[PDB]
């Protein structure tokens, strides 16, 4: 007599019989948190390969339930979106697990990358806004428990490997939920050492100068060549389109083509911006030569975004911009291996630094931007 499964775009929801909406929630990851493999292998041999992680679990869940916490699961299962794990098989496993746990659960399943994939808060928002009958949930009185907690190697005998991910801790961080690992929570073990990602999205503002030094000017009244340098996905093209192309700069993009073109623009009295990655000295030298040959100045706009800032931005645009071209990790690390910072010795008249800043986004999108989006 359960409401049962609901299948949405990039989300599955199960509401067991006996589920009641509540103003506080005790939520859990599934794999590595409530269950683990019965086979003792790192990854399951089959849908049947599971057991309850610790015998202490059902008792704790009963206690929570009697105290009025709505019991919830937030589980990433991208295998489903990748077509590696049938949704209909996974639904059966969840129902079996829920039988064994023996308490009413509401389960949310993130089948794909994006807004619903922990650590992004899409599943919380769905629970609160769509699946709790409109009862506001107090985050401070709630709790999320999960094994992707960013723990270092060896936090326990036989744990010679760090957590595969920090997605569960960061999910709780994004939502504002108190957090605990399965061992801390069910076993009362002392807190384990953990790391957070070096780039913290909450510390990214729209303040500060557009470029440095501020005494410089973005535009030149005369012909010139501007060489843009920085990670793909960092927002260079957007910056270039907005500030130079809109001012009549000619947009060169070597991929779609390079020198003769740059030269042709200069003879016409035009100014040119080379909107590419241009990670190293040989890459850039083509354009400096062109400028030198034409006798026009060559400047570099050096975009400060780190690799993690660029990857964060890429993920954000993947979630919010229908026209965004996804930058692959292959391209990111390839750029990083090639990268040599620009210097004046290369033949640049000057180098402007373009600090990485928050774009001009609506309130909701700014809130999304400050969320960690990868474990």
| Chain residues that interact with Mg ion, rule: CB under 5 A | 29, 31-32, 147
By beta-carbon proximity to Mg ion, the closer residue of 73 and 225 is 73
Handedness of CA 195, 200, 131, 96 (dihedral sign): negative
Minimum CB–partner distance for residue 182 and Mg ion (Å): 9
Closer to Mg ion at the Cβ: 29 or 298? 29
* 3-state class (DSSP) for residue 21: coil
CB-wise, 147 or 224, nearer to Mg ion? 147
User: Is the Cβ–Cβ distance between 157 and 107 less than 8 Å?
Assistant: no
Q: How far apart are CA 26 and CA 220, in angstroms?
A: 59
Phi, psi of 60 (to 5 degrees): -60, -35
Question: Is 230 labeled as ligand-binding?
Answer: yes
Q: Judge if the upstream peptide bond of residue 119 is cis by omega within 30 degrees of 0.
A: yes
Say what angle helices 87-101 and 57-66 make with each other, to 10 degrees: 80
Beta strands in 216-286 (DSSP E): 225-229, 250-252, 272-274
232 labelled binding-site residue: yes
Question: How are beta strands 35-36 and 51-52 bridged, if at all?
Answer: antiparallel
Task: Answer yes or no: is 114 a known binding residue.
Answer: no
Shortest distance in whole angstroms from residue 14 CB to Mg ion? 17
Task: Please give the structure tokens belonging to residue 31.
Answer: 């794999």
**The pairing of beta strand 298-303 with beta strand 225-229:** parallel
Best CA proximity match to 53, nearest among 73, 68, 34? 34
How many DSSP H helices and E strands does the chain contain? 12, 14
Cβ closer to Mg ion: 32 or 122? 32
Q: C-beta of 168: minimal distance to Mg ion in Å? A: 6
- Would you say 71 or 234 has its CB closer to Mg ion? 71
Q: From CA 28, how far away is CA 25, in angstroms rounded?
A: 10
What single string gives the DSSP state of each residue in 50-94?
-EES-TTHHHHHHHHHHTTPEEEEEEE-HHHHTTSS-HHHHHHHH
Output 31 or 183, the one with its CB closest to Mg ion: 31
Whether 233 has a binding-site annotation, put simply, is yes
Nearest-angstrom CA–CA distance, 272 and 291: 10
- State phi, psi for 256 to the nearest 5 degrees: -85, -5
User: Which residue, 26 or 252, is less far from Mg ion as judged by CB?
Assistant: 26
Shortest Å distance, C-beta 112 to Mg ion: 17
Nearest distance from C-beta of residue 98 to Mg ion, angstroms: 16
Q: How far is the CB of 191 from Mg ion (least distance, A)?
A: 18
> Of all helices (H) and strands (E), which one includes residue 108?
strand 106-110
Closest CB to Mg ion among residues 109, 234:
109
237 has binding-site annotation: yes
Judged by beta carbon, residue 149 or residue 352, the one nearer Mg ion is 149
Minimum CB–partner distance for residue 29 and Mg ion (Å) = 4
Specify whether the CB–CB gap between 176 and 25 falls below 8 A.
no
Residue nearest to Mg ion (CB): 32
**Pair type for strands 25-28 and 70-76:** parallel
Residue 66 CB, nearest approach to Mg ion (Å): 26
| In the complex, minimum distance from the CB of residue 113 to Mg ion, in angstroms, rounded to a whole number | 17
- Annotated binding site, which residues? 230-237
- Annotated binding site for ATP, which residues? 230-237
């Amino acid at each position: 007599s359960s409401l049962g499964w609901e299948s949405l775009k990039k989300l599955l929801v199960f509401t067991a019989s006996g589920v009641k909406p509540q103003g506080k929630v005790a939520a859990f990851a599934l794999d590595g948190t409530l269950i683990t493999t019965r086979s003792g292998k790192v990854f399951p041999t089959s849908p049947s390969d599971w057991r309850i992680l610790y015998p202490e679990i059902p008792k704790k869940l009963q206690e929570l339930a009697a105290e009025g916490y709505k019991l919830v699961i937030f589980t990433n299962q991208m295998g489903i979106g990748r077509g590696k794990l049938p949704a209909e098989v996974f639904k059966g496993k969840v129902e079996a697990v829920l039988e064994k746990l023996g308490v009413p659960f509401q389960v949310l399943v993130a089948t794909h990358a994006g807004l619903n994939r922990k650590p992004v808060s899409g599943m919380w928002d769905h629970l609160q806004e769509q699946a709790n009958e409109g009862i506001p949930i107090s985050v401070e009185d709630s709790v999320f428990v999960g094994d992707a907690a960013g723990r270092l190697a060896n936090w326990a005998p036989g744990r010679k490997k760090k957590d595969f991910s920090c997605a569960d801790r960061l999910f709780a961080l994004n939502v504002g939920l108190p957090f605990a690992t399965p061992e801390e929570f069910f076993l009362k073990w002392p807190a384990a050492r953990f790391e957070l990602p070096a780039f913290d999205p909450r510390t990214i503002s729209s303040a500060g100068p557009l470029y440095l030094p501020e005494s410089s000017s973005l535009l030149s009244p005369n012909p010139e060549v501007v060489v843009a340098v920085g990670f793909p996905g960092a927002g260079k093209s957007t910056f270039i389109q907005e500030h130079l192309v809109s001012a009549g700069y000619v947009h060169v993009n070597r991929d779609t083509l390079c020198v003769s073109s740059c030269q042709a623009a200069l003879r016409q009295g035009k100014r040119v911006v080379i909107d590419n990655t241009n990670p190293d000295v040989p890459s850039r030298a083509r354009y400096i030569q062109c400028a030198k040959d034409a006798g026009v100045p060559c400047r570099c706009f050096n975009f400060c975004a780190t690799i993690e800032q660029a990857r964060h931005n890429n993920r954000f645009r993947e979630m919010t911009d229908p026209s965004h071209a996804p930058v692959s990790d292959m391209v990111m690390f390839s750029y990083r291996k090639q990268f040599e910072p620009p210097t004046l010795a290369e033949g640049f008249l000057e180098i402007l630094e373009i600090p990485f800043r928050l774009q001009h986004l609506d309130p909701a999108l700014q809130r999304l931007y400050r969320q960690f989006s990868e474990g």
